[PDB]
C-alpha cells in the first residue's frame, strides 16, 4: 500500500509548538446584514444590525421573527456571496477569514431546509441470497422502508422484508428477465416490466399476481412510470405509462386492465418515460429527440425537442421525488381517506413545484453526446441550458428531492453536481475507478449514493462536496442502488446475485 509522505522534523517541531485556540473576542462589534431569499430574491427587513456573537440557530429564529411566522418556524441555511456558507457563527465563518468585516454590510442568502435529518449509511445491514441470476432492478416501498421489490434475470422478482432482512414473497409470472420494477405511489401494487414484452401487476401484501399480464408490446419494456396521485381524482387508481424498445409508449388503465393510448412518434427505442405533475408525459428515445405528450389532448405529441446529437439515455424531472412518493412523507404516515391522500399529494407536489412566483417543472436530459440539456418545456421550446464537461456518456441523471441540485453519473468514473435552476456547474465527485451506473438522493437532499462498475457504493455529502464514506462488499458489478423514503436503508444489487442492505 502506497502511503502519504511522513511529516518532517521541522513539521514535528511545529506540531509540538503550542496551538492557538479560536475563541470569539468579547469586544466583537455589531455588523449590518441583509437577509435575501435564495429562491425568490425577496429582501426581508432591509438592512439590520446584529451583534457579532450571533449563532446560526439565533439567526434562524431572528429571520422567522422578521418574517412573522414564529408560531411554525421553518429551518434555513445561510450563505454569503465566493459563496461561503455560515457554519456556526458569522465571525468564524466570514469575519475570521477577513473577507467580510464589521464595517461592510453582509448579504446573507437563506435557503429552506428539511426538519428531519438522514444519517449516512456506513455498514452493510445484510447480504441476502435467493435470486438465481444477476439483480437488474430494485425499488423501495413509498409508504414503508421495510419492503423492497427486486427484479432479476431469473425471470422473477422478490419482495424482501427489510426489517429482518429476509425474503417475503416471490413473483414468478414472467418468462424472461425482469428489466424494471415500480411501486405504485399509493403503495398498493408493484408493476414489473420484463424482457418477454410483458407487464405484470402484483399485490405486495399477498405477494400475488393481479390476473394476467399486460400484453401488447413487441419488444422488451424499458421503463415504467405511474400517474401522480395528486392528479388522480379520489376514488380512482393511478394509470401506468410504459415505454419499450419498439418505440411506443402505452398507457394502461389497471382497474379495467386495458390499454387506452399508444403513443408512437419515436423512430427508435424509447430510453425512458416520465409522467409529470401537469398531465404531461416526457419520453426520451434513441432517435436523439425528447417528445412531450399531453394526456388531456388524447395523447398527442405536443412538443418535439431536438438538441442532442446522440441517444438521450435518461431524463429526470424537478418533481420526480414528489411524484414517486405521492401522499407519503419521511414519517411514513398514511392518509385516512383517498380525498385526504389526494390533498396531501397536492400539497407535497406544490411545495416543490410552485415557488418563486409561478410553478415550474424543469427537465434534464442526459445523452450519449457526453452532455445534458436543461429544459423548461411548458415555457419555451429551447433548452434553458447545456451542461457539458463529462468526457464520456452521461448514463444517469437525477434531480434532488427539493429540485435545487442536479447530479449526473457518467462512464468517465465521475459524478457531476450542477445547480438545479440555471444548470451551472458546481462540483465533481471523484473517487470511483470504474463507470458510475446509477445514483440516488437521500430524502433531505444532503446525501448522495452511487453504485459503480468497480463493485462499490459511495456516499457523498452534498454540502461539503466531498466523499463521505466508501462501501465495498459486493463481489461483482453493482447495477442498482436505491435509498429509502425515510432515509434509513439503502439497497444495492448487481452481478453477484445478492441483495445488500446498508444502514447507519
Amino acid at each position: 500500500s502506497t502511503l502519504i509522505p511522513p511529516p518532517s522534523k521541522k513539521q514535528k517541531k511545529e506540531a509540538q509548538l503550542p496551538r492557538e485556540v479560536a475563541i470569539i473576542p468579547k469586544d466583537l462589534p455589531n455588523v449590518s446584514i441583509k437577509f435575501q431569499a435564495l429562491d425568490t430574491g425577496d429582501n426581508v427587513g432591509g438592512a439590520l444590525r446584529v451583534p457579532g456573537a450571533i449563532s446560526e440557530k439565533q439567526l434562524e429564529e431572528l429571520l422567522n421573527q422578521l418574517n412573522g411566522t414564529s408560531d411554525d418556524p421553518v429551518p434555513y441555511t445561510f450563505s454569503c456571496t465566493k459563496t461561503i456558507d455560515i457554519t456556526d457563527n458569522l465571525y468564524s465563518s466570514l469575519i475570521k477569514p477577513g473577507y467580510n468585516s464589521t464595517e461592510d454590510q453582509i448579504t446573507l442568502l437563506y435557503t429552506p431546509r428539511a426538519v428531519f435529518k438522514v444519517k449516512p449509511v456506513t455498514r452493510s445491514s445484510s447480504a441476502i441470497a435467493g435470486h438465481g441470476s444477476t439483480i437488474l432492478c430494485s425499488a423501495f416501498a413509498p409508504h414503508t422502508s421495510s419492503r423492497m421489490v427486486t427484479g432479476a434475470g431469473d425471470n422473477t422478482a422478490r419482495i424482501w422484508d427489510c426489517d429482518t432482512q429476509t425474503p417475503m414473497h416471490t413473483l414468478k409470472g414472467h418468462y424472461n428477465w425482469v428489466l424494471c420494477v415500480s411501486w405504485s405511489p399509493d403503495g398498493e401494487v408493484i408493476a414489473t416490466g420484463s424482457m418477454d414484452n410483458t407487464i405484470r401487476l402484483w399485490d405486495p401484501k399477498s405477494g400475488q399476481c393481479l390476473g394476467d399480464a399486460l400484453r401488447g408490446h413487441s419488444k422488451w419494456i424499458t421503463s415504467l412510470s405511474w400517474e401522480p396521485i395528486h392528479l388522480v381524482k379520489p376514488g380512482s387508481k393511478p394509470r401506468l405509462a410504459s415505454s419499450s424498445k419498439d418505440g411506443t409508449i402505452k398507457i394502461w388503465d389497471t382497474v379495467s386492465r386495458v390499454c387506452q393510448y399508444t403513443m408512437s412518434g419515436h423512430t427508435n427505442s424509447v430510453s425512458c418515460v416520465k409522467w409529470g405533475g401537469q398531465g404531461l408525459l416526457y419520453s426520451g428515445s434513441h432517435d436523439r429527440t425528447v417528445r412531450v405528450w399531453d394526456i388531456n389532448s388524447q395523447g398527442r405529441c405536443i412538443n418535439i425537442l431536438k438538441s442532442h446529437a446522440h441517444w438521450v439515455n435518461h431524463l429526470s424531472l424537478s418533481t420526480d421525488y414528489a411524484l414517486r412518493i405521492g401522499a407519503f412523507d419521511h414519517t411514513g404516515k398514511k392518509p385516512s381517506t383517498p380525498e385526504e391522500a389526494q390533498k396531501k399529494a397536492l400539497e407535497n407536489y406544490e411545495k416543490i413545484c410552485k415557488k418563486n412566483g409561478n410553478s415550474e417543472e424543469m427537465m434534464v436530459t442526459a445523452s450519449d453526446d457526453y452532455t445534458m440539456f436543461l429544459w423548461n418545456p411548458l415555457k419555451s421550446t429551447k433548452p434553458i441550458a447545456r451542461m457539458t464537461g463529462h468526457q464520456k456518456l452521461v448514463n444517469h441523471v437525477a434531480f434532488s428531492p427539493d429540485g435545487r441540485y442536479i447530479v449526473s453519473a457518467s462512464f468517465d468514473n465521475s459524478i457531476k453536481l450542477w445547480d438545479g435552476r440555471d444548470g451551472k456547474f458546481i462540483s465533481t465527485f471523484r473517487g470511483h475507478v470504474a463507470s458510475v451506473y446509477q445514483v440516488a438522493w437521500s430524502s433531505d437532499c444532503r446525501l448522495l449514493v452511487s453504485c459503480s462498475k468497480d463493485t462499490t457504493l459511495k456516499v457523498w455529502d452534498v454540502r461539503t462536496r466531498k466523499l463521505s464514506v466508501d462501501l465495498p462488499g459486493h463481489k461483482d458489478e453493482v447495477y442498482t442502488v436505491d435509498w429509502s423514503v425515510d432515509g434509513k436503508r439503502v439497497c444495492s444489487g448487481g452481478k453477484d446475485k445478492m441483495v445488500r442492505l446498508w444502514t447507519h
Partner: protein, 230 residues
C-alpha cells in the same frame, strides 16, 4: 457534361447494338476462363488465385447455409443492453537462452583488440531515472531503441487487452542476472500498472499494481505482449 451524364446518355441514345449479346457471351465464357486461369496462372498469381477461389467457395457455402437456416424457421440491465463489449503460471517452462545468444561482444580499440564490452540483444526495462554509465566504465550496454515502457496486457476475465505501463521486472526465468538487468523475454514476470482496469480489493483499496507474464518474444515481434495473473 454534368451530373449523371453517362446515365442520361444511355437513357437518350441506348447502348451499342451488340452490347447485351456481347455481355451475355462473356458471362457464358467466364467458366472456361476461370478454369483456364486456374490451370495456366503460375507462381504468385496462381497461389493468390487459388486462395481467392477457396475464400469465395467458403463464403458461398456460408450464404447457402444462412439462407437454409432462415428458411427452416447474460442478464444486462436496461441501460446496458444494445451496448456491446492452483497457482501455476500460463508458461511454466520456456525456451532457454544462453549468454552467447543474450549478449553480443563489442570490441574496442583502434585495432579492435579489447573485447570486455557486452551488448544485450533483447528488449530491456530500465525503470524510472535511468542514466547511462560513463562509457569508460560501461560494460553492459542496453541500447535505447530496445528499451520498453509499456506492454499489451490481456485480462483473462472479460477478454480485454490494454496498453499498460510497466513498473518492474519481477522474475526472468532464464537467470536472476537477467532479472536484475531487466531483460524482457518470453515467460518473464513483470509488474504492471492496472489503474485503468478499475480493480478494488474486498477491503476497498484500489489495485494499481499487479503481475503479468510475457507471452511473446519482443525481440522478434517488436512489442511486449503479456497475460495478467488473476
Amino acid at each position: 457534361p454534368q451530373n449523371d451524364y453517362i446515365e442520361r446518355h444511355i437513357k437518350q441514345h441506348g447502348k451499342r447494338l451488340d452490347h447485351e449479346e456481347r455481355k451475355r457471351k462473356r458471362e457464358a465464357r467466364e467458366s472456361h476462363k476461370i478454369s483456364e486461369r486456374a490451370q495456366k496462372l503460375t507462381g504468385w498469381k496462381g497461389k493468390q488465385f487459388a486462395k481467392k477461389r477457396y475464400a469465395e467457395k467458403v463464403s458461398m457455402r456460408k450464404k447457402i447455409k444462412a439462407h437454409e437456416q432462415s428458411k427452416v424457421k447474460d442478464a444486462l440491465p436496461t441501460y446496458l443492453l444494445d451496448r456491446e463489449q492452483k497457482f501455476s503460471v500460463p508458461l511454466p517452462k520456456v525456451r532457454g537462452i544462453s549468454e552467447e545468444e543474450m549478449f553480443k561482444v563489442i570490441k574496442t580499440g583502434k585495432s579492435r583488440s579489447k573485447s570486455w564490452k557486452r551488448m544485450i540483444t533483447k528488449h530491456t526495462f530500465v525503470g524510472e531515472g535511468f542514466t547511462r554509465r560513463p562509457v569508460k566504465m560501461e560494460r553492459i550496454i542496453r541500447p535505447s531503441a530496445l528499451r520498453q515502457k509499456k506492454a499489451n496486457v490481456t485480462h483473462p476475465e472479460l477478454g480485454v487487452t490494454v496498453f499498460l505501463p510497466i513498473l518492474a521486472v519481477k522474475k526472468n526465468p532464464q537467470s536472476p542476472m537477467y532479472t536484475q538487468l531487466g531483460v524482457l523475454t518470453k515467460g518473464t514476470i513483470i509488474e504492471v500498472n492496472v489503474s485503468e482496469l478499475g480493480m478494488v480489493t474486498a477491503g476497498g483499496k484500489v489495485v494499481w499494481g499487479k503481475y503479468a507474464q510475457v507471452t511473446n518474444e519482443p525481440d522478434r515481434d517488436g512489442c511486449v505482449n503479456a497475460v495478467l495473473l488473476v
